[PDB]
């Protein structure tokens, strides 16, 4: 249930491959993306990290899992505050 997404983190300069888990919540997905961005090229911030479909106006709920979100492998997401 390894699940590849392409993730763009807010204020970073690129989109990156991040392999998450089919059963990860959006919170868990955001932490996995954050690992490859925050304190690497993006300053740490207070507040809640949220996930969305790339350039969408709607956020996935924090405890929705990848499996139930409707996302498909290799689709692009943003992680934003």
Partner 1 sequence: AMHPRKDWYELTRATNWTPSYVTEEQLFPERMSGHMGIPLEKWESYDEPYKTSYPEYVSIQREKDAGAYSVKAALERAKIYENSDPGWISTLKSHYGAIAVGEYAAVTGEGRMARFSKAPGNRNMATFGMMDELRHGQLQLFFPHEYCKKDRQFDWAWRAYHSNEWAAIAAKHFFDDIITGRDAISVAIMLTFSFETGFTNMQFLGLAADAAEAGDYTFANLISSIQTDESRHAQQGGPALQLLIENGKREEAQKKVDMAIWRAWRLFAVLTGPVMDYYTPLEDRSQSFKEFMYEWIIGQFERSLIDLGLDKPWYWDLFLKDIDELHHSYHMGVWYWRTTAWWNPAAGVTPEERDWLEEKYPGWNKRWGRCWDVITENVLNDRMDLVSPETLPSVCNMSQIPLVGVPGDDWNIEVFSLEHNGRLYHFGSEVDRWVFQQDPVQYQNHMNIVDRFLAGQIQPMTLEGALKYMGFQSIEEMGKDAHDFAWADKCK
Binding site for partner 1 (CB under 8 A): 4, 6, 8, 10-19, 35-36, 39-43, 54-55, 72-76
64 contacts 25 by C-beta, under 8 angstroms:
yes
Angle (nearest 5°) at CA 52 between 72 and 10 = 120
Q: How far is the CB of 61 from partner 1 (least distance, A)?
A: 23
Tell me which of Ca ion, partner 1, none is bound by residue 59, counting a contact when its beta carbon lies within the kind-specific cut-off of 5 to 8 angstroms.
none
Q: How far is the CB of 24 from partner 1 (least distance, A)?
A: 15
Nearest one of 43, 1, 39, 34 to 16, comparing CA atoms:
34
Q: Given the structure tokens 């699940």, which residue do they identify?
A: 3
- Write the binding mask 39 to 68 for Ca ion: x where contact by CB under 5 A, - elsewhere: ----------------------------x-
């Amino acid at each position: 249930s390894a699940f590849p997404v392409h993730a763009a983190f807010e204020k970073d300069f690129l989109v990156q491959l991040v392999v998450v888990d089919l059963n990860d919540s959006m919170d868990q997905v955001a932490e996995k993306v954050a690992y490859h961005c925050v304190n690497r090229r993006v300053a740490p911030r207070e507040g809640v990290m949220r996930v969305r479909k790339h350039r969408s106006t709607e956020l996935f709920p924090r405890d929705m899992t990848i499996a139930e979100s409707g996302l498909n492998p290799t689709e692009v997401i943003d992680v934003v505050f």
